[PDB]
Design a protein around this ligand. Structure first.
Ligand SMILES: CCCCCCCCCCCCC/C=C\[C@H](O)[C@H](N)CO
Ligand SMILES: *C(=O)CCCCCCCCCCCCC
Ligand SMILES: *C(=O)CCCCCCCCCCCCC
Lengths: 283, 60, 268, 5, 60, 50, 268, 5
């Protein structure tokens, strides 16, 4: 029944003491933190406490859209030697660092995912030609479904994959997704492998990456400009924002202290000294 | 199907309320209520088998 | 208690095994959750589970290691450290799936004239960092899984530069808890400290923790045990003191699903 | 109709 | 004319509901309710004239 | 087709099943817009021969 | 039954294993006693027993042998024939004591044009006679215990005359049931006959039988399985017919006491 | 008014 926006406990007035009760003395070897409050070691006045922990609830701590990737696409002249660029991104929160670090204060999590898409475009060649307003197709390709090989091949039909057709210059696109994990929670850390190496099998055959579970965890987003080729080339970027709604988290962890180095917990030489010089008896 | 909840009113100019209606079948589409619960830190701050009495010796 | 009972004096009995201690600092139950069997409401594989009970839920003692002034720390993974322990190991390798909780009892006595403090941490999903700066996530199954001998921490990161035949092992730097986070914060994990003047053991009761009700014990370790000297060993005025550290661990409420022929892993 | 919290 | 139905709530943060009002005369304009029924597979899996008892011989 | 379930041929435990067939209902299987054609049109200069 | 049920058509399910048969001759429960766990009123070792349940009480198939016109017969001992079978064998070798019952299913099909009859006998304490006439009771542990391959009967007693290095094996003469008593009387033991025109299997449910509630499985065999051709194999007009015989056996209600390190026997 | 399912 205690809610996140409830006020914290009042300070009760306490006077002088002389007893066998020893709140100040403890033993951290036990694994416990001493539950003390100011009235245990100093004289206090009565204060009616109004402050609350509302903004540090798990939901409120995460209640923000974070950028997780930038996808690049274009629409060139038909005469180009290089193919029309469509983008393919393997969904993850580990390409950027900020949301990753926040989620990694915890070992496991459950949440509904809100994805918001901000789309910007520009001219590249110092031309004077124009381009009519672009429509973009953001196709979700779940693990197993055919990945596009060309900006215009059959897969963009999307009979079953979810697609967003976004019109340039309109409000940024947005969809929600349920908790889609194949486990009862998302694992931010997996201390294991996806294969057991057997003795009767070759080393190559039993091998797999440390800490990786499903190779294609959540599938792909594929993005294209739906408009046909245009004389003047336009390049666009799709910025993807992830917000974890309706979230639950388990098993707290110390936050990432040295720079991220890949999708695992690995660290690079030369980045291992976060702390700065400060003298023991200097304020 | 309207949900009526109260706001915690910070700066002032009764209970002021706000209204919420869900427009979609999937709870995943819903906004966050922010009507969240708190819990005691004990599973992390006092994970010991024998209950700690802070005025008593932690070791006896 | 007025009839002599103490926080410091405990007896633990599991199966045909008993541990006694006269210098404990209470004992810890991780996240306040005692180990339990998998409930029908949370169950997933439908076949009748194997539950070996006293045959596997008993205290197994691993190889004793040695604490010296140069020790940087030790680590073990569960269930890996127990993979060769009597009928627990057998039940593990014969089944696809398995889940288990543990009582971990770390032992280290000295004398009223020695000093030092070991932080004993139980970490859920204790993913450790690799030795390479050319490839991430490349620690081999064999090196990730030392069995009962465990591994050690180092004070220095030193990258494997042999690109022809890479070592493919962890390089766990102690002040970074071997995983890129600061050791001073490891206390948010279930822990006890063996501070020689106060106590000669640590006892951690660990529930099965995972994002699943049951999983591959052979592919995945649920818990990591990390022991690090928070305050170094010291004795009288000797330059080279040594005291032993012994781990005894008991599986608890372990059950297994998906029986077939025995798994024979490539461990070297 | 209406729920009230 | 509001229809109030419950959501099957998957991830959690009572019954959570949602509201639906039809804006058009033609049922063809309506969204899909997704409030669908299941049936037994028997017309395809057991199309036999004499009822099958699985513990018994299929042929006697 | 033989209507068997695991408890017919192996020893089973009690499991409280939570999974549902909601996403494979006929409606849900088809509940997606599929592209069926691409129509081409233009608007040329008035001076065009075509 | 009017709903099709037959004495000849059975399904047996134990653990993750099922046997079906469409040509049985009912099934036998030795001495009318179904296997049971040891009751507290009859209990003897006081330690908590291990009861592996589905992990060991399941159907294990031994190596298939071959029946020909020259076959004199085969024998196996229990628990010895199962000593290397999955977690049953493991639980056996890790404990001082163990008791178990069994479902024995002997399999042998042919055709409406073949003929022959196998007597399948389950004998309590099936002590077999040795090959020597210089020394009695001298069959070695290794030869007494063939494991799953079993042994065979002979129509001729032939004494081991090498006194320097004696064979130390059994010489089980078929019409003497390998133990000095006439085979025609073996029917007082729990049995079935596989007579090819009538049935293609034998099923014997065996209770744990012993003069003790529990005993050393490694030192002592409780039951012997003896299969002998009461009427020889014959087919059409072929001079050398062959049909296979397969044994599948399931431990039932097995429990073990006295857990320690694993027994590693000298088997060769 | 309102239907409720
Ligand atoms: C039209 C756009 C549809 C977008 C559909 C996206 C569906 C995939 C959701 C991905 C969920 C990612 C959750 C985050 C990562 C996991 O926590 C960890 N790597 C552990 O499993
Ligand atoms: C409960 O909701 C009954 C009261 C209805 C109040 C007006 C609803 C406002 C419009 C909601 C439209 C439907 C959303 C798909
Ligand atoms: C039943 O619908 C009675 C309640 C009306 C609730 C408010 C309706 C919201 C606006 C609907 C407009 C009409 C749609 C053409």
């Amino acid at each position: 029944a205690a809610t996140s926006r409830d006020a914290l406990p009042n300070t009760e007035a306490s006077g002088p003491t002389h007893s066998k009760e020893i709140p100040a003395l403890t033993a951290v070897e036990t694994g416990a933190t001493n539950p003390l409050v100011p009235s245990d070691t100093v004289q206090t006045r009565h204060v009616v406490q109004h402050r609350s922990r509302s903004e540090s609830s798990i939901e409120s701590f995460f209640a923000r859209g974070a950028c997780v990737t930038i996808m690049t696409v274009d629409n060139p002249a038909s005469t180009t030697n290089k193919d029309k660029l469509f983008a393919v991104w393997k969904i993850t929160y580990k390409d950027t660092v900020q949301l990753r670090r926040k989620l990694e204060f915890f070992t496991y999590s459950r949440f509904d995912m809100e994805l918001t898409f901000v789309v910007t475009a520009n001219f590249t060649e110092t031309n004077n030609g124009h381009a009519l307003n672009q429509v973009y197709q953001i196709m979700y390709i779940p693990p197993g479904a055919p990945v596009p090989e060309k900006w215009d091949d059959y897969t963009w039909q999307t009979s079953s994959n979810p697609s967003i057709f976004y019109t340039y210059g309109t409000a940024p696109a947005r969809i929600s997704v349920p908790y889609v994990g194949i486990s009862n929670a998302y694992s931010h850390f997996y201390d294991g492998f996806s294969k057991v190496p057997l003795k009767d099998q070759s080393a190559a055959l039993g091998d797999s990456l440390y800490g990786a579970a499903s190779l294609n965890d959540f599938g792909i987003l594929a993005v294209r400009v739906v408009n046909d080729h245009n004389p003047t080339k336009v390049t666009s970027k799709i910025r993807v924002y992830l917000k974890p709604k309706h979230i639950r988290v388990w098993c707290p962890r110390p936050p990432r202290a040295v720079a991220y180095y890949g999708p695992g917990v690995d660290y690079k030489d030369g980045t291992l000294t976060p702390l700065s010089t400060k003298d023991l008896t200097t304020y | 199907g309207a949900q009526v909840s109260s706001q915690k009113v910070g700066a002032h100019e009764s209970t002021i309320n706000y209204t919420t209606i869900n427009y979609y079948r999937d709870s995943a589409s819903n906004a966050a209520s922010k009507q969240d619960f708190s819990q005691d830190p004990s599973k992390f701050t006092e994970p010991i088998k024998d209950v700690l009495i802070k005025t008593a010796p932690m070791l006896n | 208690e007025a009839c002599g009972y103490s926080d410091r004096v405990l007896q633990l009995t599991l199966g045909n095994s008993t541990i006694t201690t006269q210098e404990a600092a209470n004992s810890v139950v991780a996240y306040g959750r005692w180990p339990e069997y998998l409930r029908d409401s949370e169950a997933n594989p439908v076949d009748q589970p194997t539950e070996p009970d006293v045959a596997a839920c008993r205290f197994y003692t691993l190889d004793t290691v040695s604490w010296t002034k140069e020790s940087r720390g030790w680590w073990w993974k569960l269930p890996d450290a127990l993979r060769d322990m009597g009928l627990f190991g057998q039940n593990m390798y014969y089944h696809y799936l398995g889940r288990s909780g543990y009582t971990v009892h770390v032992q280290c006595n000295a004398s009223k004239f020695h000093q030092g403090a070991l932080g004993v941490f139980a970490v859920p999903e204790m993913c450790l960092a690799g030795d390479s700066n050319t490839t991430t996530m490349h620690t081999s199954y064999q090196n990730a899984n030392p069995g009962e001998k465990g591994g050690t921490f180092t004070g220095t990161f030193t990258p494997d530069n042999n690109q022809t035949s890479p070592a493919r092992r962890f390089c766990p730097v102690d002040y970074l808890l071997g995983n890129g986070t600061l050791l001073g914060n490891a206390f948010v994990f279930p822990h006890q400290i063996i501070n020689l003047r106060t106590n000669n053991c640590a006892t951690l009761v660990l529930p099965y923790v995972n994002s699943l009700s049951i999983d591959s014990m052979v592919k995945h370790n649920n818990w990591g045990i990390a022991i690090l000297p928070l305050a170094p060993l010291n004795f009288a005025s000797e330059s080279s003191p040594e005291i032993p550290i012994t781990l005894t661990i008991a599986p608890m409420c372990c059950e297994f699903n998906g029986l077939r022929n025995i798994t024979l892993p490539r461990l070297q | 109709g209406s729920s009230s919290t």
